Short mmCIF file of N, CA and C in Angstrom, two decimals:
data_model
loop_
_atom_site.label_atom_id
_atom_site.label_comp_id
_atom_site.label_asym_id
_atom_site.label_seq_id
_atom_site.Cartn_x
_atom_site.Cartn_y
_atom_site.Cartn_z
N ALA A 1 -15.22 5.32 3.08
CA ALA A 1 -14.43 4.97 4.28
C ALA A 1 -12.78 4.71 4.08
N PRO A 2 -12.13 5.40 4.78
CA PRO A 2 -10.58 5.40 4.60
C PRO A 2 -9.85 4.05 4.70
N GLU A 3 -9.64 3.46 3.41
CA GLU A 3 -9.01 2.13 3.58
C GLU A 3 -7.67 2.18 4.06
N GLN A 4 -7.18 0.99 4.64
CA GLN A 4 -5.84 0.94 5.31
C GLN A 4 -5.00 0.17 4.18
N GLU A 5 -3.55 0.67 4.40
CA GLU A 5 -2.60 -0.13 3.47
C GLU A 5 -1.48 -0.20 4.23
N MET A 6 -0.52 -1.27 3.86
CA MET A 6 0.49 -1.71 4.61
C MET A 6 1.48 -1.42 3.56
N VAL A 7 2.84 -0.46 3.99
CA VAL A 7 3.83 -0.27 3.31
C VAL A 7 5.24 -0.64 4.07
N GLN A 8 5.93 -0.98 3.49
CA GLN A 8 7.39 -1.54 3.91
C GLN A 8 8.55 -0.52 3.72
N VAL A 9 9.28 0.37 4.36
CA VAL A 9 10.01 1.23 4.14
C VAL A 9 11.44 0.60 4.64
N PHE A 10 12.66 0.70 3.79
CA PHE A 10 13.65 0.00 4.21
C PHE A 10 14.59 1.24 4.79
N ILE A 11 15.42 1.08 5.64
CA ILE A 11 16.09 2.22 6.40
C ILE A 11 17.49 1.58 6.76
N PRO A 12 18.58 2.51 6.78
CA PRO A 12 19.79 1.83 7.05
C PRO A 12 19.66 1.35 8.36
N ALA A 13 20.37 0.13 8.51
CA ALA A 13 20.35 -0.68 9.75
C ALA A 13 20.85 0.11 11.03
N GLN A 14 21.77 1.14 10.80
CA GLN A 14 22.30 1.94 11.88
C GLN A 14 21.36 2.96 12.55
N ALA A 15 20.32 3.31 11.73
CA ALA A 15 19.16 4.25 12.04
C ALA A 15 18.07 3.78 12.77
N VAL A 16 17.96 2.39 13.02
CA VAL A 16 16.90 1.92 13.86
C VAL A 16 16.58 2.55 15.22
N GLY A 17 18.00 2.93 15.87
CA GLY A 17 17.87 3.38 17.08
C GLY A 17 17.29 4.70 17.15
N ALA A 18 17.57 5.61 16.16
CA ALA A 18 16.89 7.02 16.12
C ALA A 18 15.48 6.77 15.84
N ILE A 19 15.03 5.83 15.06
CA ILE A 19 13.50 5.65 14.56
C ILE A 19 12.97 5.04 15.93
N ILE A 20 13.41 4.01 16.43
CA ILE A 20 12.98 3.68 17.81
C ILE A 20 12.91 4.68 18.82
N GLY A 21 14.02 5.35 19.19
CA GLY A 21 14.28 6.33 20.15
C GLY A 21 14.32 5.53 21.67
N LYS A 22 14.78 6.27 22.65
CA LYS A 22 14.97 5.64 23.91
C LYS A 22 13.90 5.25 24.64
N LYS A 23 13.78 4.06 25.01
CA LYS A 23 12.64 3.23 25.56
C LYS A 23 11.32 3.34 24.60
N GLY A 24 11.60 3.38 23.37
CA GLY A 24 10.78 3.29 22.22
C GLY A 24 9.92 4.78 22.43
N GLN A 25 10.35 5.65 22.95
CA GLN A 25 9.62 6.88 22.92
C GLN A 25 9.28 7.49 21.26
N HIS A 26 10.14 7.40 20.48
CA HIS A 26 9.91 8.06 19.27
C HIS A 26 8.86 7.40 18.39
N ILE A 27 9.22 6.01 18.59
CA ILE A 27 8.21 5.22 17.77
C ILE A 27 6.81 5.07 18.20
N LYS A 28 6.50 5.27 19.49
CA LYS A 28 5.24 5.18 20.11
C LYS A 28 4.68 6.56 19.68
N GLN A 29 5.28 7.86 19.67
CA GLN A 29 4.72 9.07 19.41
C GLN A 29 4.45 9.27 18.04
N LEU A 30 5.57 8.64 17.10
CA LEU A 30 5.24 8.66 15.94
C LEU A 30 3.84 7.90 15.47
N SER A 31 3.74 6.86 16.19
CA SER A 31 2.26 6.30 15.81
C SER A 31 1.18 7.10 16.19
N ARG A 32 1.15 7.92 17.17
CA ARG A 32 0.22 8.58 17.63
C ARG A 32 0.08 9.72 16.48
N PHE A 33 1.20 10.64 16.36
CA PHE A 33 0.98 11.65 15.16
C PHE A 33 0.39 11.26 14.12
N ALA A 34 0.91 10.11 13.45
CA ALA A 34 0.60 9.75 12.13
C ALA A 34 -0.99 8.90 12.24
N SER A 35 -1.32 8.59 13.48
CA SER A 35 -2.27 7.45 13.63
C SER A 35 -2.16 6.31 12.81
N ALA A 36 -1.00 5.74 12.85
CA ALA A 36 -0.73 4.48 11.92
C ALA A 36 -0.03 3.59 13.14
N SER A 37 -0.13 2.38 12.60
CA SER A 37 0.72 1.28 13.25
C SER A 37 2.30 1.18 12.88
N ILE A 38 3.45 1.23 13.57
CA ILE A 38 4.56 1.47 13.16
C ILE A 38 5.50 0.49 13.80
N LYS A 39 6.23 -0.65 12.87
CA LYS A 39 6.92 -1.51 13.70
C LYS A 39 8.19 -1.70 13.02
N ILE A 40 9.29 -1.99 13.49
CA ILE A 40 10.53 -2.62 13.02
C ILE A 40 10.17 -3.99 12.83
N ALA A 41 10.42 -4.52 11.58
CA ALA A 41 10.42 -6.04 11.44
C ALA A 41 11.49 -6.76 11.88
N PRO A 42 11.65 -7.88 12.29
CA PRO A 42 12.48 -8.71 12.72
C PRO A 42 13.73 -8.64 11.71
N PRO A 43 14.89 -8.79 12.02
CA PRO A 43 15.99 -8.76 10.98
C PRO A 43 15.80 -9.95 10.19
N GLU A 44 15.87 -10.21 9.01
CA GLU A 44 15.80 -11.60 8.44
C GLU A 44 17.26 -12.20 8.62
N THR A 45 18.40 -11.43 8.51
CA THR A 45 19.80 -11.97 8.85
C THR A 45 20.73 -10.97 9.45
N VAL A 46 20.09 -3.14 5.47
CA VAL A 46 18.72 -2.17 5.74
C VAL A 46 17.85 -3.06 6.80
N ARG A 47 17.08 -2.48 7.45
CA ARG A 47 15.96 -2.93 8.28
C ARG A 47 14.66 -2.28 7.70
N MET A 48 13.80 -3.14 7.98
CA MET A 48 12.34 -2.82 7.38
C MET A 48 11.31 -2.24 8.30
N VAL A 49 10.80 -1.06 8.12
CA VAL A 49 10.02 -0.45 9.01
C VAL A 49 8.49 -0.87 8.23
N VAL A 50 7.41 -1.23 8.90
CA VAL A 50 6.26 -1.75 8.53
C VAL A 50 5.34 -0.66 9.17
N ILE A 51 4.70 0.00 8.00
CA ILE A 51 3.86 1.00 8.51
C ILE A 51 2.27 0.61 7.91
N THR A 52 1.39 0.63 8.84
CA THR A 52 -0.21 0.22 8.48
C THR A 52 -0.87 1.18 8.81
N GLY A 53 -1.91 1.88 7.83
CA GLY A 53 -2.91 2.86 8.11
C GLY A 53 -3.43 3.25 6.65
N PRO A 54 -4.37 4.23 6.84
CA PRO A 54 -4.82 4.78 5.53
C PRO A 54 -3.94 5.94 5.23
N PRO A 55 -4.32 6.46 3.92
CA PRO A 55 -3.31 7.25 3.04
C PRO A 55 -2.72 8.30 3.91
N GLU A 56 -3.34 9.08 4.54
CA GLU A 56 -3.05 10.28 5.42
C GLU A 56 -1.84 9.79 6.49
N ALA A 57 -2.54 8.68 7.20
CA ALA A 57 -1.32 8.22 8.19
C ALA A 57 -0.19 7.74 7.40
N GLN A 58 -0.20 7.24 6.24
CA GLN A 58 0.98 6.93 5.66
C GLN A 58 1.98 8.11 5.38
N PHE A 59 1.27 9.04 4.82
CA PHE A 59 2.18 10.36 4.47
C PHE A 59 2.76 10.88 5.73
N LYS A 60 1.99 10.99 6.85
CA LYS A 60 2.75 11.66 8.08
C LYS A 60 3.63 10.61 8.55
N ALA A 61 3.63 9.40 8.76
CA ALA A 61 4.56 8.32 9.31
C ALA A 61 5.71 8.34 8.39
N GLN A 62 5.63 8.12 7.00
CA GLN A 62 6.73 8.08 6.01
C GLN A 62 7.55 9.52 6.04
N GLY A 63 6.79 10.70 6.08
CA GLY A 63 7.23 11.80 6.30
C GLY A 63 8.07 12.07 7.41
N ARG A 64 7.81 11.55 8.58
CA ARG A 64 8.62 11.57 9.95
C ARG A 64 9.86 10.89 9.73
N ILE A 65 9.91 9.56 9.27
CA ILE A 65 11.00 8.87 9.11
C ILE A 65 11.94 9.31 8.14
N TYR A 66 11.55 9.96 7.11
CA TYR A 66 12.54 10.39 5.97
C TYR A 66 13.23 11.87 6.75
N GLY A 67 12.19 12.55 7.75
CA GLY A 67 12.67 13.73 8.34
C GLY A 67 13.90 13.39 9.46
N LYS A 68 13.37 12.28 10.20
CA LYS A 68 14.27 11.73 11.35
C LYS A 68 15.67 11.43 10.81
N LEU A 69 15.69 10.81 9.70
CA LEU A 69 16.90 10.35 9.27
C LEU A 69 17.54 11.20 8.59
N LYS A 70 17.08 12.54 7.93
CA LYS A 70 17.63 13.70 7.56
C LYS A 70 18.13 14.56 8.95
N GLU A 71 17.48 14.52 9.92
CA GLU A 71 17.93 15.26 11.09
C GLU A 71 19.08 14.75 11.90
N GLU A 72 19.26 13.27 11.63
CA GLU A 72 20.28 12.56 12.29
C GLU A 72 21.54 12.37 11.38
N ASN A 73 21.68 13.13 10.28
CA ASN A 73 22.77 13.25 9.30
C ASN A 73 23.17 11.83 8.90
N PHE A 74 22.08 10.78 8.52
CA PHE A 74 22.45 9.58 8.20
C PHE A 74 22.82 9.42 6.83
N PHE A 75 22.50 10.39 6.03
CA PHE A 75 22.97 10.49 4.59
C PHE A 75 24.10 11.29 4.29
N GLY A 76 24.05 12.58 4.46
CA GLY A 76 25.09 13.55 4.24
C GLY A 76 24.61 14.94 4.26
N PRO A 77 25.53 15.84 4.20
CA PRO A 77 25.10 17.31 4.54
C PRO A 77 24.30 17.80 3.29
N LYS A 78 24.70 17.30 1.88
CA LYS A 78 24.15 18.00 0.81
C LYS A 78 23.10 17.06 0.18
N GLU A 79 22.76 16.00 0.78
CA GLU A 79 22.16 14.63 0.54
C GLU A 79 20.77 14.73 0.92
N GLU A 80 19.72 14.62 -0.11
CA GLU A 80 18.25 14.42 0.19
C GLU A 80 18.24 12.93 0.37
N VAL A 81 17.28 12.72 1.54
CA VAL A 81 17.00 11.36 1.91
C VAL A 81 16.52 10.45 0.90
N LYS A 82 16.91 9.48 0.43
CA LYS A 82 16.18 8.55 -0.57
C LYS A 82 16.17 7.16 -0.14
N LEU A 83 14.87 6.72 -0.03
CA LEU A 83 14.82 5.22 0.55
C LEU A 83 14.03 4.43 -0.33
N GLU A 84 14.04 3.15 -0.39
CA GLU A 84 13.38 2.29 -0.86
C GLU A 84 12.15 1.61 -0.14
N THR A 85 10.91 1.75 -0.97
CA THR A 85 9.70 1.38 -0.17
C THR A 85 9.18 0.20 -1.25
N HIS A 86 8.57 -0.83 -0.38
CA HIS A 86 7.78 -1.96 -1.20
C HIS A 86 6.51 -1.82 -0.83
N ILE A 87 5.42 -1.76 -1.73
CA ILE A 87 4.15 -1.83 -1.71
C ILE A 87 3.45 -3.02 -2.58
N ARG A 88 2.28 -3.53 -2.17
CA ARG A 88 1.44 -4.64 -2.64
C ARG A 88 0.58 -4.22 -3.51
N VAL A 89 0.28 -4.89 -4.64
CA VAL A 89 -0.90 -4.45 -5.51
C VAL A 89 -1.47 -5.83 -5.84
N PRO A 90 -2.83 -5.68 -6.02
CA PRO A 90 -3.39 -7.09 -6.77
C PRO A 90 -2.49 -7.55 -7.99
N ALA A 91 -2.19 -8.67 -8.22
CA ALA A 91 -1.47 -9.17 -9.24
C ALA A 91 -2.38 -8.77 -10.61
N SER A 92 -3.62 -8.99 -10.30
CA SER A 92 -4.53 -8.58 -11.75
C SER A 92 -4.39 -7.21 -11.88
N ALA A 93 -3.82 -6.44 -11.19
CA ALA A 93 -3.67 -4.75 -11.51
C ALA A 93 -2.29 -4.66 -11.82
N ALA A 94 -1.41 -5.58 -11.55
CA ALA A 94 0.19 -5.10 -11.84
C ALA A 94 0.23 -4.90 -13.31
N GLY A 95 -0.51 -5.54 -14.25
CA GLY A 95 -0.07 -5.24 -15.71
C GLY A 95 -0.76 -3.70 -15.89
N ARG A 96 -1.56 -3.32 -15.06
CA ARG A 96 -2.17 -1.99 -15.44
C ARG A 96 -1.25 -0.73 -14.58
N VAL A 97 -0.36 -1.26 -13.75
CA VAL A 97 0.65 -0.39 -13.17
C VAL A 97 1.84 -0.31 -14.06
N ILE A 98 2.14 -1.31 -14.87
CA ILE A 98 3.17 -1.38 -15.97
C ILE A 98 2.64 -0.52 -17.20
N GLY A 99 1.41 -0.82 -17.56
CA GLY A 99 0.78 -0.38 -18.82
C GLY A 99 1.10 -1.42 -19.83
N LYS A 100 0.58 -1.24 -21.00
CA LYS A 100 0.84 -1.63 -22.27
C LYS A 100 2.13 -1.35 -22.59
N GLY A 101 3.09 -2.43 -23.10
CA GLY A 101 4.31 -1.94 -23.69
C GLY A 101 5.05 -1.49 -22.43
N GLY A 102 4.72 -0.71 -21.34
CA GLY A 102 5.46 -0.24 -20.31
C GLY A 102 5.04 1.02 -19.87
N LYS A 103 4.06 1.68 -20.56
CA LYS A 103 4.21 3.23 -20.63
C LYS A 103 3.75 3.92 -19.39
N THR A 104 2.78 3.41 -18.66
CA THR A 104 2.41 3.81 -17.47
C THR A 104 3.51 3.95 -16.41
N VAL A 105 4.37 2.95 -16.22
CA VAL A 105 5.45 3.05 -15.23
C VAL A 105 6.45 3.69 -15.84
N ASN A 106 6.85 4.16 -17.10
CA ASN A 106 7.58 4.87 -17.70
C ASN A 106 7.08 6.31 -17.36
N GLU A 107 5.96 6.84 -17.48
CA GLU A 107 5.40 8.06 -17.29
C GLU A 107 5.33 8.30 -15.90
N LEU A 108 5.07 7.53 -14.84
CA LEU A 108 5.42 7.62 -13.56
C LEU A 108 6.73 7.80 -13.24
N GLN A 109 7.73 7.37 -13.46
CA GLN A 109 8.99 7.53 -13.56
C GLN A 109 9.48 8.98 -14.07
N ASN A 110 8.91 9.34 -15.22
CA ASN A 110 9.31 10.68 -15.78
C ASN A 110 8.80 11.61 -15.04
N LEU A 111 7.42 11.52 -14.41
CA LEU A 111 6.88 12.50 -13.78
C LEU A 111 7.41 12.89 -12.38
N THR A 112 7.65 11.70 -11.46
CA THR A 112 8.05 11.84 -10.26
C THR A 112 9.59 11.71 -10.00
N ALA A 113 10.33 11.19 -10.97
CA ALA A 113 11.87 10.91 -10.75
C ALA A 113 11.94 10.04 -9.79
N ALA A 114 10.96 9.22 -9.27
CA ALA A 114 11.17 7.99 -8.57
C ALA A 114 11.59 6.84 -9.55
N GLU A 115 12.25 5.88 -8.92
CA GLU A 115 12.44 4.67 -9.79
C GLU A 115 11.22 3.86 -9.14
N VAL A 116 10.87 3.05 -10.16
CA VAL A 116 9.55 2.36 -10.02
C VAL A 116 9.64 1.04 -10.88
N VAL A 117 9.63 -0.09 -10.13
CA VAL A 117 10.02 -1.42 -10.80
C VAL A 117 9.09 -2.31 -10.40
N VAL A 118 8.50 -3.21 -11.37
CA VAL A 118 7.64 -4.18 -11.02
C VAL A 118 8.30 -5.52 -11.29
N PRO A 119 8.99 -6.36 -10.24
CA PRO A 119 9.53 -7.52 -10.91
C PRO A 119 8.76 -8.41 -11.39
N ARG A 120 9.27 -9.10 -12.70
CA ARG A 120 8.25 -9.71 -13.35
C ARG A 120 8.08 -11.39 -13.36
N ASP A 121 8.95 -11.83 -12.47
CA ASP A 121 8.99 -13.39 -12.22
C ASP A 121 8.37 -13.95 -10.88
N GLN A 122 7.22 -12.92 -10.35
CA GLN A 122 6.81 -12.91 -8.92
C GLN A 122 5.66 -14.05 -8.83
N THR A 123 5.55 -14.60 -7.68
CA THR A 123 4.41 -15.45 -7.34
C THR A 123 3.56 -14.67 -6.33
N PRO A 124 2.24 -14.45 -6.83
CA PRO A 124 1.62 -13.79 -5.88
C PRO A 124 1.28 -14.41 -4.63
N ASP A 125 1.12 -13.59 -3.55
CA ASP A 125 1.12 -13.93 -2.34
C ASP A 125 -0.24 -14.72 -1.90
N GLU A 126 -0.67 -14.83 -0.60
CA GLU A 126 -1.99 -15.37 -0.38
C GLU A 126 -2.93 -14.56 -0.57
N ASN A 127 -2.76 -13.24 -0.68
CA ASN A 127 -3.95 -12.15 -1.14
C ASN A 127 -3.79 -11.90 -2.54
N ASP A 128 -3.36 -12.80 -3.51
CA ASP A 128 -3.21 -12.45 -4.99
C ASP A 128 -2.31 -11.01 -5.16
N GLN A 129 -1.24 -10.79 -4.30
CA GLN A 129 -0.68 -9.57 -4.47
C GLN A 129 0.80 -9.79 -4.67
N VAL A 130 1.44 -8.80 -5.48
CA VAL A 130 2.67 -8.86 -5.99
C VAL A 130 3.36 -7.50 -5.51
N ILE A 131 4.82 -7.18 -5.42
CA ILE A 131 5.58 -6.27 -4.92
C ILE A 131 5.73 -5.27 -6.18
N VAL A 132 5.50 -3.96 -5.77
CA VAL A 132 6.12 -2.79 -6.67
C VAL A 132 7.14 -2.16 -5.73
N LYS A 133 8.29 -1.97 -6.29
CA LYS A 133 9.51 -1.41 -5.64
C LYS A 133 9.47 0.06 -5.99
N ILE A 134 9.55 1.15 -5.07
CA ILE A 134 9.74 2.66 -5.20
C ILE A 134 10.93 3.01 -4.45
N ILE A 135 11.82 3.48 -5.44
CA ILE A 135 12.89 4.25 -4.49
C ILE A 135 13.05 5.78 -5.11
N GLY A 136 13.04 6.82 -4.12
CA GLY A 136 13.10 8.08 -4.24
C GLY A 136 13.25 9.05 -2.93
N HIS A 137 13.02 10.40 -3.30
CA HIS A 137 12.96 11.16 -2.06
C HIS A 137 11.56 11.11 -1.69
N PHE A 138 11.19 11.84 -0.64
CA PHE A 138 9.85 11.81 0.19
C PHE A 138 8.93 12.15 -0.87
N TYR A 139 8.92 13.25 -1.47
CA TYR A 139 7.99 13.72 -2.31
C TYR A 139 7.71 12.85 -3.48
N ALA A 140 8.78 12.42 -4.11
CA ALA A 140 8.82 11.53 -5.18
C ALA A 140 8.36 10.14 -4.92
N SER A 141 8.67 9.42 -3.78
CA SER A 141 7.82 8.31 -3.30
C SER A 141 6.33 8.46 -3.12
N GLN A 142 6.12 9.73 -2.20
CA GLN A 142 4.66 9.88 -2.09
C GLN A 142 3.86 10.10 -3.37
N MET A 143 4.33 10.59 -4.50
CA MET A 143 3.60 10.81 -5.66
C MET A 143 3.40 9.51 -6.45
N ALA A 144 4.44 8.67 -6.44
CA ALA A 144 4.46 7.56 -6.92
C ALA A 144 3.43 6.71 -6.43
N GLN A 145 3.44 6.57 -4.99
CA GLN A 145 2.47 5.67 -4.16
C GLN A 145 1.00 6.25 -4.46
N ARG A 146 0.83 7.63 -4.44
CA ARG A 146 -0.45 8.31 -4.67
C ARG A 146 -1.01 7.61 -6.11
N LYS A 147 -0.31 7.89 -6.96
CA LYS A 147 -0.63 7.54 -8.45
C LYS A 147 -0.93 6.25 -8.58
N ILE A 148 -0.07 5.35 -8.00
CA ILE A 148 -0.24 3.64 -8.15
C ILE A 148 -1.68 3.45 -7.38
N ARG A 149 -1.95 3.99 -6.31
CA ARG A 149 -3.12 3.80 -5.69
C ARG A 149 -4.30 4.21 -6.53
N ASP A 150 -4.32 5.29 -7.01
CA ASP A 150 -5.36 5.66 -8.01
C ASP A 150 -5.50 4.88 -9.28
N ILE A 151 -4.31 4.20 -9.79
CA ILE A 151 -4.57 3.39 -10.89
C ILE A 151 -5.28 1.95 -10.12
N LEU A 152 -4.85 1.65 -9.07
CA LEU A 152 -5.51 0.54 -8.51
C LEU A 152 -7.11 0.47 -8.36
N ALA A 153 -7.59 1.86 -7.76
CA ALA A 153 -8.93 2.10 -7.77
C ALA A 153 -9.53 2.10 -9.01
N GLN A 154 -8.86 2.64 -10.18
CA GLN A 154 -9.54 2.52 -11.42
C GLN A 154 -9.73 1.17 -11.79
N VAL A 155 -8.70 0.32 -11.84
CA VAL A 155 -9.05 -1.16 -12.35
C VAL A 155 -10.11 -1.91 -11.56
N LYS A 156 -10.25 -1.54 -10.14
CA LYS A 156 -11.12 -2.15 -9.30
C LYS A 156 -12.69 -1.84 -9.83
N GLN A 157 -12.89 -0.64 -10.01
CA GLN A 157 -14.43 -0.31 -10.63
C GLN A 157 -14.41 -1.16 -12.03
N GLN A 158 -13.73 -1.04 -13.06
CA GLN A 158 -13.60 -1.52 -14.30
C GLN A 158 -13.48 -2.92 -14.16
#
């Protein structure tokens, strides 16, 4: 059964208008395209897009956010869109995302050219989960997320 995941994508504050669209048109139809729930989180004081859905939904929705930002010239003419994404992993599995000595997060970064960072002083949330930070282009971020998901599923069996 397609399990659901929640991802937080940070976008430039000024881009919220193009993601939402007039009368919310763009964010509704993006939800239908991806078959995902897609929400702009309230400002704490970048803005955070919260995407909830299974992996294929995540791919479609995230793909369209990177694409919309590209199309609106939010970055630059020669500039690939690079965004920060936060995902949550079991605390008991974070040490396996890092690897012994740090070898798996290193391999991740070398394979994808995404920057992947597990902050080390975290308090697990009420679901015993901690943040992994992913910064990169669309493909790099997708590949980091897919790999981390596969690591988690491995730890779960064993």
